[PDB]
mmCIF file of C-alpha atoms in Angstrom:
data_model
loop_
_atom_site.group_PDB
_atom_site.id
_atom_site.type_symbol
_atom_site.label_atom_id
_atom_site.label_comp_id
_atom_site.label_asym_id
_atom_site.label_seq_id
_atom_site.Cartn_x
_atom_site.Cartn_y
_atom_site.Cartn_z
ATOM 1 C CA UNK A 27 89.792 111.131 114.291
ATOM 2 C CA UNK A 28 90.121 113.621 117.359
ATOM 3 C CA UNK A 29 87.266 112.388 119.003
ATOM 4 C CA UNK A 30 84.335 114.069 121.112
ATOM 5 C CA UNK A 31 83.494 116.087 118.775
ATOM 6 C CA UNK A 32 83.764 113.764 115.896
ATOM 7 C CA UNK A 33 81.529 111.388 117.687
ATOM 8 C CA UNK A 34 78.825 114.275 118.167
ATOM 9 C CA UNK A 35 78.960 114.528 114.722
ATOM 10 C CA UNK A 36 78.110 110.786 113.651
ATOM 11 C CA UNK A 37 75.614 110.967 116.417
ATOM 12 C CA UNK A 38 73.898 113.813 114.422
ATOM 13 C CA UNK A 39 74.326 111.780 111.166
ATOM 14 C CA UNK A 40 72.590 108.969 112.491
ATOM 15 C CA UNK A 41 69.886 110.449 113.973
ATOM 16 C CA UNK A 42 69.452 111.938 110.134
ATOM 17 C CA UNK A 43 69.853 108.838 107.802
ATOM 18 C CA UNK A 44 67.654 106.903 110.196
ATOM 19 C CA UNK A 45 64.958 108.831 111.180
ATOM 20 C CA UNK A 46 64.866 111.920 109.665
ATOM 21 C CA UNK A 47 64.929 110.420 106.155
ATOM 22 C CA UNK A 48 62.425 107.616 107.584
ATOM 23 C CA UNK A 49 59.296 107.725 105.934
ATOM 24 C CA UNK A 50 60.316 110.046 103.371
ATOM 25 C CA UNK A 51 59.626 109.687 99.874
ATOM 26 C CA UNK A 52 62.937 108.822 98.160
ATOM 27 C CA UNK A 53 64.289 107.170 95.427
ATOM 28 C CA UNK A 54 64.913 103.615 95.106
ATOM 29 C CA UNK A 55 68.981 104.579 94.810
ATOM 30 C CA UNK A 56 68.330 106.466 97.796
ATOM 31 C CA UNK A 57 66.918 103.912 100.030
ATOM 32 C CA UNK A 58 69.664 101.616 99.056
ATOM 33 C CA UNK A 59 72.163 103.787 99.865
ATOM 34 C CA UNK A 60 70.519 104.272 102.981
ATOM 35 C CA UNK A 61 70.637 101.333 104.173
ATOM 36 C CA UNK A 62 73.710 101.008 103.390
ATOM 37 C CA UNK A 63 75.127 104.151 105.577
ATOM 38 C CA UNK A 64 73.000 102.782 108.038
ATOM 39 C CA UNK A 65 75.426 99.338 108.062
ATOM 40 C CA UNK A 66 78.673 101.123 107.980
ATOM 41 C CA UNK A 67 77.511 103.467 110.281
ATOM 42 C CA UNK A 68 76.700 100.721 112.751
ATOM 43 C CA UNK A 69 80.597 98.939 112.112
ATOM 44 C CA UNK A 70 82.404 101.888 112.251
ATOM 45 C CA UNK A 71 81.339 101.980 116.774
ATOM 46 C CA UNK A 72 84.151 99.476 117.003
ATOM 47 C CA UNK A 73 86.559 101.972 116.013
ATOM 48 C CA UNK A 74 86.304 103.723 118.999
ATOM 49 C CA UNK A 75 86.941 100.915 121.657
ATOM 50 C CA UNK A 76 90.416 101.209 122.601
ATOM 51 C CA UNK A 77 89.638 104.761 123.636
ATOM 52 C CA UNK A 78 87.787 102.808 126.526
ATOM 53 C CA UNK A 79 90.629 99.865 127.086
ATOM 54 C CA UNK A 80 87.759 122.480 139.955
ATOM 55 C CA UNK A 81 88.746 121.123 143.066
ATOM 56 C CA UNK A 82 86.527 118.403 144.936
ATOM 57 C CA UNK A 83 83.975 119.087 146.888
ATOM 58 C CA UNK A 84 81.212 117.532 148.892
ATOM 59 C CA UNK A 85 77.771 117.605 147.142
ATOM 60 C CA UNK A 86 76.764 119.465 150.767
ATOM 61 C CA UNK A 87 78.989 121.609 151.057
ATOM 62 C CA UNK A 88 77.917 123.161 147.574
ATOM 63 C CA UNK A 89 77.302 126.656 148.367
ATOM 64 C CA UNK A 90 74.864 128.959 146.936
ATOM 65 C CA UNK A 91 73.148 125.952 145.367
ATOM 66 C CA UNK A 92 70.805 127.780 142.569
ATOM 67 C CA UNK A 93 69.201 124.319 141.702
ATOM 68 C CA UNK A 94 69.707 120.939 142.268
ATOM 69 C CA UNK A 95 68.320 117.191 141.832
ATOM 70 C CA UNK A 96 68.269 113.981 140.239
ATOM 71 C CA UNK A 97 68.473 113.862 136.590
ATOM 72 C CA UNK A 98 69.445 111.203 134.045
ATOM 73 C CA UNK A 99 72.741 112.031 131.973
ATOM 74 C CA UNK A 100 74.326 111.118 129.225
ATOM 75 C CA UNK A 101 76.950 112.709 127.011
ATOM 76 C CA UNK A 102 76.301 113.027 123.293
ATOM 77 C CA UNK A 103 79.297 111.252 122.138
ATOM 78 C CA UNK A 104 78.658 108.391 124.635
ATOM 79 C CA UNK A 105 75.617 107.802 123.250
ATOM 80 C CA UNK A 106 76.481 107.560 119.721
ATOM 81 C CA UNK A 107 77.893 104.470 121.012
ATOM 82 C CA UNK A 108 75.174 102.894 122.665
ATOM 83 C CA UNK A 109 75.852 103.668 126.483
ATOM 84 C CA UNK A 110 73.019 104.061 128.897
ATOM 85 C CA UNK A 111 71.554 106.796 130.745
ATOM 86 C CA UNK A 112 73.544 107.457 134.364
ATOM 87 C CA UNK A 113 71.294 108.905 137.148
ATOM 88 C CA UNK A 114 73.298 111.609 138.621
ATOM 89 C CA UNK A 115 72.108 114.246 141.817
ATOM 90 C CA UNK A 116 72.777 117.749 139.490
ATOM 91 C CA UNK A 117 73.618 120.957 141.271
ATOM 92 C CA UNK A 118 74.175 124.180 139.749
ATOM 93 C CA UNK A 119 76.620 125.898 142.631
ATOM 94 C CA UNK A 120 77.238 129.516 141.437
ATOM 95 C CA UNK A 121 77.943 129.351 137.610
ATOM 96 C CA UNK A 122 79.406 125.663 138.085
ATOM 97 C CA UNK A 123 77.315 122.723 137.094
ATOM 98 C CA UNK A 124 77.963 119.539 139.492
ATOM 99 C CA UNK A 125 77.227 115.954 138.914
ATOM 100 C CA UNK A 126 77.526 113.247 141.687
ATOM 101 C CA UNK A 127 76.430 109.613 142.052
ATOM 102 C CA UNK A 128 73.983 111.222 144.859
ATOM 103 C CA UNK A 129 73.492 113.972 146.961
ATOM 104 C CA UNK A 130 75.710 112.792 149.986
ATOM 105 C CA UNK A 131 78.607 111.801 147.873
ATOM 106 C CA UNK A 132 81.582 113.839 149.259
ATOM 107 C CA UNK A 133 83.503 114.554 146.153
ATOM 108 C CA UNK A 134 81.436 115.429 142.182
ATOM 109 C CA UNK A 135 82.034 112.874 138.956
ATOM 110 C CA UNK A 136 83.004 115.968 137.682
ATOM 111 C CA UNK A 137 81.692 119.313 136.804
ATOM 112 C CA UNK A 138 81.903 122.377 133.784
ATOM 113 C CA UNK A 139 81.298 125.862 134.362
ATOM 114 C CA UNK A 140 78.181 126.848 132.182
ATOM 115 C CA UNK A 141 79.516 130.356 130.848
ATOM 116 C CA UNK A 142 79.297 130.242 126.996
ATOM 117 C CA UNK A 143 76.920 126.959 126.809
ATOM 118 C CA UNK A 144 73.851 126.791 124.934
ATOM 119 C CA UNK A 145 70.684 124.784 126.735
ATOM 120 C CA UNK A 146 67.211 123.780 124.928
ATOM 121 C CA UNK A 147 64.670 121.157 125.163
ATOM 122 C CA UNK A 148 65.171 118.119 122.295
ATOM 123 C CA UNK A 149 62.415 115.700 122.435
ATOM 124 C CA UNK A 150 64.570 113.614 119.553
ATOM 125 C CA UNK A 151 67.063 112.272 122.307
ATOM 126 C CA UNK A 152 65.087 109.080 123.246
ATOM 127 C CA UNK A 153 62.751 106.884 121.437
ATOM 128 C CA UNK A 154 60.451 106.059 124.890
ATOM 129 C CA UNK A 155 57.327 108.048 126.810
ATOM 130 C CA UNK A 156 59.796 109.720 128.907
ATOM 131 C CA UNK A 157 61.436 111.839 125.341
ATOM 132 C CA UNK A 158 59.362 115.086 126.290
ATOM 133 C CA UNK A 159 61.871 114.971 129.790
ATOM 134 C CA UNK A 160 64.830 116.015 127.520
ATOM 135 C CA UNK A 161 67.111 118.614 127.089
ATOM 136 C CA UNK A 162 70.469 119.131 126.365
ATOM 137 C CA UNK A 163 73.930 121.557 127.784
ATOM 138 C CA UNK A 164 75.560 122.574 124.620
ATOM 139 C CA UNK A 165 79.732 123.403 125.340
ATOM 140 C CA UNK A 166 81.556 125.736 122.683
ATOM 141 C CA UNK A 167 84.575 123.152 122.542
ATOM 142 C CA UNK A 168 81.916 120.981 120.912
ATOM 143 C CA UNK A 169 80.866 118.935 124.507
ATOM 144 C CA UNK A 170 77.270 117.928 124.443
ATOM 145 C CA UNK A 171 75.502 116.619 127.876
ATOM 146 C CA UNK A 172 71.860 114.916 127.376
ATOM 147 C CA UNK A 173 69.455 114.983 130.126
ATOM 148 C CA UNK A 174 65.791 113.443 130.925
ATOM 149 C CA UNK A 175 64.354 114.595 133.932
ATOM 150 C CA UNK A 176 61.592 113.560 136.123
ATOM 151 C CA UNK A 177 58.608 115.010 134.294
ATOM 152 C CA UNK A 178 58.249 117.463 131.855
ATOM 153 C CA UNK A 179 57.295 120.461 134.065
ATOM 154 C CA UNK A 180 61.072 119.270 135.581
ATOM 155 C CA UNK A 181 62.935 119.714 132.296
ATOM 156 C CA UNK A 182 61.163 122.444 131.981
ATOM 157 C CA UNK A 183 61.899 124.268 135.075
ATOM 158 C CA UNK A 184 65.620 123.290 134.539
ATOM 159 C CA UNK A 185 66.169 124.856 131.046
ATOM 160 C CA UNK A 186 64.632 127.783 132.360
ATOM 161 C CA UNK A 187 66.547 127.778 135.283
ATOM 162 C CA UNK A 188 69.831 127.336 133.077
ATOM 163 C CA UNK A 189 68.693 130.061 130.641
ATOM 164 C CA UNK A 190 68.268 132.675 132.741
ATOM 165 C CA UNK A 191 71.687 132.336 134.404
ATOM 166 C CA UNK A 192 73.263 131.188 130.754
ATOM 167 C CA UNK A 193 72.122 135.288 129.724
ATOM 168 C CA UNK A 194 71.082 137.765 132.549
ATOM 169 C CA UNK A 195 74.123 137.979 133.646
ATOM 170 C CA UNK A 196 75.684 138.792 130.599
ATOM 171 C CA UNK B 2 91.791 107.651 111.536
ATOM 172 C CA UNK B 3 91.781 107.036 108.049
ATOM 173 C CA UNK B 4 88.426 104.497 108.626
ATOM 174 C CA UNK B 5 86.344 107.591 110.215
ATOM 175 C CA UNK B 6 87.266 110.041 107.337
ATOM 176 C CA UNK B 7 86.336 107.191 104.832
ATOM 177 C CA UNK B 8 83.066 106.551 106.342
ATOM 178 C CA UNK B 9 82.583 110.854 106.501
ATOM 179 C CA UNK B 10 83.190 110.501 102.478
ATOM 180 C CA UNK B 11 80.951 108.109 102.122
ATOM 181 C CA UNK B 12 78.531 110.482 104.693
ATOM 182 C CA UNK B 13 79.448 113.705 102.731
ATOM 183 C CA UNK B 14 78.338 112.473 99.652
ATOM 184 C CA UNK B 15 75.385 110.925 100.352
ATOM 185 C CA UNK B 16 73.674 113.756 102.278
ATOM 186 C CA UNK B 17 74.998 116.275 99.707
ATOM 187 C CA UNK B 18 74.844 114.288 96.315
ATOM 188 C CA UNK B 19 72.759 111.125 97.170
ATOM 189 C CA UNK B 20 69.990 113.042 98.524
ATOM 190 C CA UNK B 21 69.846 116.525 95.864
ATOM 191 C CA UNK B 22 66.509 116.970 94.384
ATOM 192 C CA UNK B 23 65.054 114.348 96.298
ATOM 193 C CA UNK B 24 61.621 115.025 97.643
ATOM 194 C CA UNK B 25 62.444 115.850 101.519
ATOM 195 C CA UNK B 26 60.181 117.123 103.768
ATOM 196 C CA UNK B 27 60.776 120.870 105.180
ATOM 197 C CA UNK B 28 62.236 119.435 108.117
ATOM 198 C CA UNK B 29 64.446 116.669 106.334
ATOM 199 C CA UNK B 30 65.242 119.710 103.916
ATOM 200 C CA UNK B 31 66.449 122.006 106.919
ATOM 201 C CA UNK B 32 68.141 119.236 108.891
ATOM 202 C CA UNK B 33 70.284 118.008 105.523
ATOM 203 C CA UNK B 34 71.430 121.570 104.779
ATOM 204 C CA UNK B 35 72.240 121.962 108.305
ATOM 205 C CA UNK B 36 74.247 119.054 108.560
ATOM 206 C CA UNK B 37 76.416 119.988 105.141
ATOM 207 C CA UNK B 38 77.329 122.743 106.912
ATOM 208 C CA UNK B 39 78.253 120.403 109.744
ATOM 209 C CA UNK B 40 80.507 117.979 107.916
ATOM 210 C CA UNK B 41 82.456 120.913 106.332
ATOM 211 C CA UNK B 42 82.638 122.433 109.960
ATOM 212 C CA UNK B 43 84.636 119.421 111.080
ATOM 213 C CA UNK B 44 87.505 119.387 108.317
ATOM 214 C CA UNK B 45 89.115 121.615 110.830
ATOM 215 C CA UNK B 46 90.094 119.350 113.256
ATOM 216 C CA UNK B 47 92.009 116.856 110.877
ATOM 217 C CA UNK B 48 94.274 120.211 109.911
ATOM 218 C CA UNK B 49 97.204 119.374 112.804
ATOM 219 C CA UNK B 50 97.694 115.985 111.547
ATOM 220 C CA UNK B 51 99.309 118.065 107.858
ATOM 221 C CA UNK B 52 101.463 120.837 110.299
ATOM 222 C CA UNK B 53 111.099 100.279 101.697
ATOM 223 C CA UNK B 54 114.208 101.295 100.001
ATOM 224 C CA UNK B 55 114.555 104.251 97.901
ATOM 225 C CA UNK B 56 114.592 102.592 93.966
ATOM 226 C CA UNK B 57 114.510 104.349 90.826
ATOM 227 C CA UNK B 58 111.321 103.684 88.378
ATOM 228 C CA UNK B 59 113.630 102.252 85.991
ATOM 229 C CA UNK B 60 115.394 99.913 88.203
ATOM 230 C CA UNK B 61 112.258 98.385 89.232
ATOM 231 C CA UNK B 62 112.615 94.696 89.540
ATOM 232 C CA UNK B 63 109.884 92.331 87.932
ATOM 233 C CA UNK B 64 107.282 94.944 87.095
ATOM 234 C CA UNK B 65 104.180 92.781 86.459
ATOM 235 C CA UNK B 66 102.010 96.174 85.001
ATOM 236 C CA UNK B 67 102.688 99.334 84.671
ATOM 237 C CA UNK B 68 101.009 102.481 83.442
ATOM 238 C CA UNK B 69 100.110 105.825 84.553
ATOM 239 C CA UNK B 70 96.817 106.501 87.193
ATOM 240 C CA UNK B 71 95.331 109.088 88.458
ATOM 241 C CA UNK B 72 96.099 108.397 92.378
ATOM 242 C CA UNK B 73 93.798 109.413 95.101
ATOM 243 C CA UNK B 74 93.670 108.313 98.685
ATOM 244 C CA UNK B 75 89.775 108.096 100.086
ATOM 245 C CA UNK B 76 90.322 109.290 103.485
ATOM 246 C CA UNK B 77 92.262 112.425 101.800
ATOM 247 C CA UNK B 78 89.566 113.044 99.253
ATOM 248 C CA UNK B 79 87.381 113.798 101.988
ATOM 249 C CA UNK B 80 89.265 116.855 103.179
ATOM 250 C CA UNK B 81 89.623 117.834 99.797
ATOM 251 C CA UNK B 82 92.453 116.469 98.636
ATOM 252 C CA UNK B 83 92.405 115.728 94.822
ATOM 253 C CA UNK B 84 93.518 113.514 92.134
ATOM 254 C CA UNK B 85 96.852 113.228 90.681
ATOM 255 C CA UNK B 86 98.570 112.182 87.888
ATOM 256 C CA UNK B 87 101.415 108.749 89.195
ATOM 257 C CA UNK B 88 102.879 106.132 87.062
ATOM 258 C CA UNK B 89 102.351 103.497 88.860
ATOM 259 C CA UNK B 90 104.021 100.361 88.576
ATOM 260 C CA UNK B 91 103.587 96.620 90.651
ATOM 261 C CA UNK B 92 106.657 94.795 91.212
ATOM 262 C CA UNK B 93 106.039 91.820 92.473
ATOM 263 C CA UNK B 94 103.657 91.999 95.203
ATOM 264 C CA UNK B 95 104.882 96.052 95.959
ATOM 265 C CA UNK B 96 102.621 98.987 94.557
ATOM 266 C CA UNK B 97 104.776 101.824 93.541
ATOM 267 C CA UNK B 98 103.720 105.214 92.442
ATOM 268 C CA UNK B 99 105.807 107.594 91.493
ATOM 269 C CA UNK B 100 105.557 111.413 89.956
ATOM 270 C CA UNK B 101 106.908 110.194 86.076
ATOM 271 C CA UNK B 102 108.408 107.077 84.763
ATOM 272 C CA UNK B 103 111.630 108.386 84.997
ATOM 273 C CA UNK B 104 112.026 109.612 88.463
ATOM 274 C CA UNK B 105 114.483 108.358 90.671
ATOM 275 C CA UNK B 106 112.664 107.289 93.660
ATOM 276 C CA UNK B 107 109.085 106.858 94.517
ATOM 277 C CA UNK B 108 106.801 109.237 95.761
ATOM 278 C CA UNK B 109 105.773 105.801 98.051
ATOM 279 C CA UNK B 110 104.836 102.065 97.592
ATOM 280 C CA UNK B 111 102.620 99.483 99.692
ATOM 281 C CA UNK B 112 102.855 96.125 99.385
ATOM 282 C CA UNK B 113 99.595 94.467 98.509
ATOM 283 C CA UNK B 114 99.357 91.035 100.423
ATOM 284 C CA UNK B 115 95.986 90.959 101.834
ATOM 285 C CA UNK B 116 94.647 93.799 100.218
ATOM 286 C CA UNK B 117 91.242 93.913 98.141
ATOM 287 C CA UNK B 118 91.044 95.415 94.464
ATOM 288 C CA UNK B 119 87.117 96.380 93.038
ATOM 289 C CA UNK B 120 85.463 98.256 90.148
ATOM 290 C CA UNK B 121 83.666 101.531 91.443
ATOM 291 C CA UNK B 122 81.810 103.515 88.870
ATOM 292 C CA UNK B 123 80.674 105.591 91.754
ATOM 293 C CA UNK B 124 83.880 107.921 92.578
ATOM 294 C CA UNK B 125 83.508 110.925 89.544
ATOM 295 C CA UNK B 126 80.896 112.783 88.455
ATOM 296 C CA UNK B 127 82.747 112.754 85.040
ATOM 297 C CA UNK B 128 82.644 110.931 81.843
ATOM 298 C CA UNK B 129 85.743 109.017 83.562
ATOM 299 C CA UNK B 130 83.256 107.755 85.784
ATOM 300 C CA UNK B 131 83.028 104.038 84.470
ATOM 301 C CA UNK B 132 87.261 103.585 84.693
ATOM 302 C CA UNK B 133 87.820 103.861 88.732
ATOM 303 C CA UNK B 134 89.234 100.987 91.000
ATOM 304 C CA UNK B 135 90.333 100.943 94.305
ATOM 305 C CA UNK B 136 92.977 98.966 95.949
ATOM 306 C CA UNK B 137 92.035 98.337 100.056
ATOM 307 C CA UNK B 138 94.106 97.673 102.977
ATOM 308 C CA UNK B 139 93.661 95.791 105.769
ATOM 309 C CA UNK B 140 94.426 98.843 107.907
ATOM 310 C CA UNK B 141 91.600 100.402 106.138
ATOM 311 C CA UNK B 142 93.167 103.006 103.824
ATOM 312 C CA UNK B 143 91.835 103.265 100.552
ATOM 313 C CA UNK B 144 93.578 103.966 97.091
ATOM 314 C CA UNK B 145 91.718 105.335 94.455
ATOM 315 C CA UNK B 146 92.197 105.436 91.194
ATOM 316 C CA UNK B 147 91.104 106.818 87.982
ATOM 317 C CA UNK B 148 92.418 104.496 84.384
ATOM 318 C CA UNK B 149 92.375 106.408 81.113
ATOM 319 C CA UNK B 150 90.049 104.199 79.520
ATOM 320 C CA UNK B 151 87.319 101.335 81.293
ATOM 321 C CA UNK B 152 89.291 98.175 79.653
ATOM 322 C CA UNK B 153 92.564 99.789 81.179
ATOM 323 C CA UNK B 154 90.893 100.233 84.859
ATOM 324 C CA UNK B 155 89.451 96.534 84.363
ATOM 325 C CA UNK B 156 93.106 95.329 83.114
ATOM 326 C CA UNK B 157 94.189 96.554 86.351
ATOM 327 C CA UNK B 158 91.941 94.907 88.631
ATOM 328 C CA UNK B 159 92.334 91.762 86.732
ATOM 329 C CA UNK B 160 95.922 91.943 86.571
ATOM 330 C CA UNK B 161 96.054 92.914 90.383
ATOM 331 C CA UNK B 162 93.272 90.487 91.571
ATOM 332 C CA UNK B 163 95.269 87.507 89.820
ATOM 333 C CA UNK B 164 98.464 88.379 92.138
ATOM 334 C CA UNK B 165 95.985 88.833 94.649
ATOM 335 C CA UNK B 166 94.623 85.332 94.327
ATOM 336 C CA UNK B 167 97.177 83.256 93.157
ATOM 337 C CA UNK B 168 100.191 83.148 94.561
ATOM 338 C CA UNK B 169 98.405 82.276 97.434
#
């Protein structure tokens, strides 16, 4: 419709009428109507195909770099349509969160200024042994970036990190 | 467009209808509440999008069946739009709806080549609920509508799935 946040929605639904409701004790018009959303759910990805048919800055030359290193990222709406995990060298410069394809690049994939975001640990954002590495950088526009870090303690550390800035500082 | 808010019906009515008084789990209880309050959230964003000659109903030419419908399109009836009373006439292969059967031009018209037609006794919680039909384009957009008796819903979809079918 007008998409990002559209996308995060249908993301949300599926993650619902697949697993949430997996395993649960419903009736039989229930599961078939399940499985059915589950099916149109699935076709309706297609839709969204011909959509794919801050100045720049070295990553050092980032000053008063809070926190930085490799993460794996993924935006919300992306996913809902299947597309993999991107490892990215994170920085968070100031108040401004970097991404680049590594830490000698001279110019960022692109960036957002945290003020306003939201940040938690999900352990729902990938089906693997490496789920308990993820958390997620809520925007108010509706954005929604995905992360899995190294380890746990590293997720961890980050959401921390990105908490305290995100509200002692009012 | 009109393909996203028809799957979002579908969606809406599930997790709110579908899926009351079922026997959900805390969390599947807390999740589906929170993600009614989700699908209503988004309604917003389709807002900007509301901010064939001109014929008379009587000079309709070759008017294979015609009646009055309750007229709803699916992708509207997700942001609330409602049913409403059209006389709607075929002519030919063109679908023409109009506010009375005496107006002088059509609220609008399609014409039906390569369009589906179907029973659905799933679109009102209503004792009207056995005499729905809905007419489907290619494009994706979906008419709904509601007959004043069961035969008279199933005399359209006959009478529609015949020119449908063959002609050819």
């Amino acid at each position: 419709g007008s998409p990002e946040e559209i996308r995060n929605l249908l993301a949300d639904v599926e993650t619902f009428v697949a697993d949430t409701l997996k395993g649960e004790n419903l009736s039989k018009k229930a599961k078939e109507k399940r499985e059915s959303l589950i099916k149109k759910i699935k076709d309706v990805k297609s839709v969204y195909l011909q959509e794919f048919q801050f100045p720049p800055i070295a990553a050092q030359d980032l000053p008063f770099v809070i926190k930085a290193g490799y993460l794996e990222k993924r935006r919300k709406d992306h996913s809902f349509l299947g597309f993999e995990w991107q490892k990215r060298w994170c920085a968070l410069s100031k108040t401004v969160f970097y991404y680049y394809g590594s830490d000698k690049d001279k110019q960022q994939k692109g960036e957002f200024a945290i003020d306003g975001y939201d940040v938690r640990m999900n352990n729902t954002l990938r089906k693997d042994g490496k789920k308990d590495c993820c958390f997620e950088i809520c925007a108010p526009d509706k954005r929604i970036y995905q992360f899995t870090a190294a380890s746990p303690k590293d997720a961890e550390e980050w959401v921390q990190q990105l908490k305290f800035i995100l509200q002692d500082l009012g």
